[model samples]
Target: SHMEDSETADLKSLAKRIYEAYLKNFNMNKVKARVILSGKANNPPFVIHDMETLCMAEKTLVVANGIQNKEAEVRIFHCCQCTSVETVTELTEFAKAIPGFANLDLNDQVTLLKYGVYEAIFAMLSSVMNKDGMLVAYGNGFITREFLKSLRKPFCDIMEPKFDFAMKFNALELDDSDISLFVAAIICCGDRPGLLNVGHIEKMQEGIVHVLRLHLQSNHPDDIFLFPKLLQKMADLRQLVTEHAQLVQIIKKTESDAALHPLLQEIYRDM
Candidate 1:
């Protein structure tokens, strides 16, 4: 709509080109924008990735952390862990599935995913979320925001920003097809540090972005701000993840009993 007045833009052709790429890479069950659950907010035991990495906590904490809603905290953790592990696997597959992504060096691919996967992960979290709370356990559970706010320091501080980001990102209302381009763009990013092939990666990003811009223009003709705002979201996602890591880092001292997954320690290690 607001993209340009030139007749050569050809928004319809843009969708057709990208859709072929989308179908070629993805399977019969295309990834959904969000997993919706039926019940009201209710709530996981464990989908923890490599449970050994969490250090098992010796006893899983029995009110020693001064947390009033200790039970709720564990359940939410299971859900967060659920989202983290599962989403990481899915998005990794999502990256590898791309037809052209194989062209990048293996280590370069690793680099891109390392920096951008969390950004895309937080971006995807919006799909399972609402202002009140988010769905978890593959949509079988809902963890309410108020209950999260009830958590003690270091633990409580990490969640609220995600909800806020989720709520706003949820407002963008981009569907699976739209987000395919977004996720693709995030991973095939030209902007990530330590990228050896900036030219090729930038080219891949531009292709997805061009298609994305056209898709939005064709889909939302009247709204001018959506594209610009989505870019801003990528910026905010970086900030949120940074703050989140900070909060999680604080947990080492405040909740010494609960250790993070070692891989996550590595993920946060260089940060």
Candidate 2:
């Protein structure tokens, strides 16, 4: 049966309420738990278990902080491969520099660092996911083809100029949604601060918004931040992000090639 207009409006209202409630109650500094429902024949009512995991992780992080404080006099070691006794002594000195590291042993300190690193890495992936949802809706790709023919040759070359220095991409070789998703992830993630290609990202954003407005009639009432507002935000963000990239470029250029990937360096330099 066709859903009544009032019913559709109620659904949107309900969704907004849920979103706001989650933002206020569940979000931890922009990290929000989201569950997606598939509109399918055999779909069932569902509850997600991620909230339990998120809560557990937060609790563990808090406890880990306490443990570090308890071990304040101990040294922190980054890896297991150190051979010098002098360096081992230095670990004790370095641990003091870290916040609340009053009592953590080297091993425990490394563990804490690892969790912190994971959170940082996951945040980038989350950003990509968030951006993709909005960009895809803006018509980045309409037919949902896994691969685009134009990208085949460049993707396969894998030569030094492109591989070591620049991030070369082709859509043709991409067949799996998971792999494609990771492509976006890799572009956004990693070690260097200013490695992102914001100009390219901005161009992509424009393409997405243009397509969505032309083909999707995307400014529907159900979606509050529709084509017009979304497009404007993307434009404004693009400029801001480009400035950020420029800031990253300064130190990145003086650093060693190994410090920043040729892939990242090339993207920024070329752009």
Candidate 3:
């Protein structure tokens, strides 16, 4: 059946309420999170590590003789391997805040977050991203794709796809409301392998998906195919997830099992 006018109005208000919940719960805004790197303005020259390196090297000598700077790899491993447990915490908070999320079976709630957190973290990337770098470390540090690519084999290869996917995802130009709806849809998905409440979850997703469609239509009247484009983007995002699973096993084997973070270990261990 077609949606009734009254029903559409109700859903719009529901989405609005959810979006309001999103803005409040979204943790840090990485862009605005930036303030005083170098006690300073937006010129985050190269790595923002220390003036010693910033003075001694431009992008040249760093990439030139930097291969032997083995500590950098270990540093990046921790910084990168650390995986910012903060994102995990924020996702769980956001999921719990959704109107009906708390009503789901307890085990179902666990299953949803376990499977969905990785996807939500990736979704959050576009918001704080720069064209060539990500502002990390309280937004004081910037990591360039060029520096990421300069790392040795396997490690270098691994980071390339993340920024590739991030930049592409950034092109969507979605508002905070839109990103929230997309992530809420991600968290509430029914396809996790052992979900106990598929009927309830699917019902929630239908409301979300409809609101998502209504959202793009009203806000982006000219984007013609934005909805399916985002759906296809989700498909590509799965490759990142798959690559991540392989990386977890890869790093676990090569190094950093201690650094892998407990929640991440739990997330990928069974799968």
179-209: candidate 1 lDDT, tens digit per residue: 6777777788888888888999988788777
| C-alpha lDDT (0 to 100) for residue 113 of candidate 1 | 82
Candidate 1 — what's its lDDT? 0.65
lDDT for each residue of candidate 3 in 131-210, tens digit (9 for 90 to 100): 56666654545666677677665667766777888778878778777778888888889877798879999998888888
Top-scoring candidate (TM-score): 3
Alpha-carbon runs more than 4 Å astray in model 3: 1-5, 30-70, 81-83, 256-258
For all candidates, the clash counts are 0, 6, 0
lDDT of 1 at 13: 54
lDDT of 2 by residue, 1-271 (tens): 7755885464344334323432332112122111221223132223212334223432432233422322111101111012122222333333333223333334444433322222222222232122112111111111111211112332212111212111112111211222222222222222223323444434433432333343223224454444454334333333443543454454355423213334334434533
| lDDT of all predictions | 0.65, 0.28, 0.72
Better of 2 and 3 by lDDT: 3
Which pairs clash in model 2? 71-102, 71-103, 71-104, 72-102, 72-103, 165-262
| Angstrom error at residue 118, model 1 | 1.1
Whose lDDT is higher: candidate 1's or candidate 3's? 3
- Using all chains and alpha carbons, the TM-scores for the candidates as numbered come to 0.75, 0.26, 0.83
